Amino acid sequence: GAMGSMERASLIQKAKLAEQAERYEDMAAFMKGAVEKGEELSCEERNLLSVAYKNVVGGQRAAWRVLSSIEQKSNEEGSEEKGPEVREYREKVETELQGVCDTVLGLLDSHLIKEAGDAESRVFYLKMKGDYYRYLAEVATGDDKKRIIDSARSAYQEAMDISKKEMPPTNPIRLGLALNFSVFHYEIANSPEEAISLAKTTFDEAMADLHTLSEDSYKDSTLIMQLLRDNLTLWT
């Protein structure tokens, strides 16, 4: 690894500078280097890792959707043949995206998940595993599509099981996990009713627990609860 010679603390410091400069590819490389030092990540460090890769893959996914839409239009009746270039370039972006997902999944497997024993870390990493398998599922079209989808489902389901046992219903990790698993049901697993049920139950159970929270925790939880409500409004 190109970060093998840099101190763990320096990698973390530079990840924070990269975030301020909106240099998310650098931020991800610094955080990958920090993970590869082999020590567990603190809560703040886990969130630096997730912010970095979410921004990198988010740009790739948005670009992939633009190119996919152009490719789809090219294959409609009446569309002039323009050659292989659109497919080739969509494939190039797709391969890069898959590489980033494989990198994240590799960090989780070697060895973040196996060392994560507290609920906040374990649920966080399993949510990430579900998310990055879900991004692979967004572009999958072949023999492995069902297994990719099931890998996302299985990771999310383990995270849900732990979060229900070990976290309050207002915990922001639990809420974001539920938000994303609901989206998985809606748009990956062809299960809109499950998506709506999960979002509604998650919202209602969080509502009932807000009275236990400080003002700052209340703000954290209600922010994600509003995202659940936004999705429910879109879907109903």
Binding site: L227, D230, N231, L234, W235
Partner: peptide, 6 residues
């Protein structure tokens, strides 16, 4: 709007 994930 696009559905939300976090």
């Amino acid at each position: 709007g696009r559905r939300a994930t976090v």
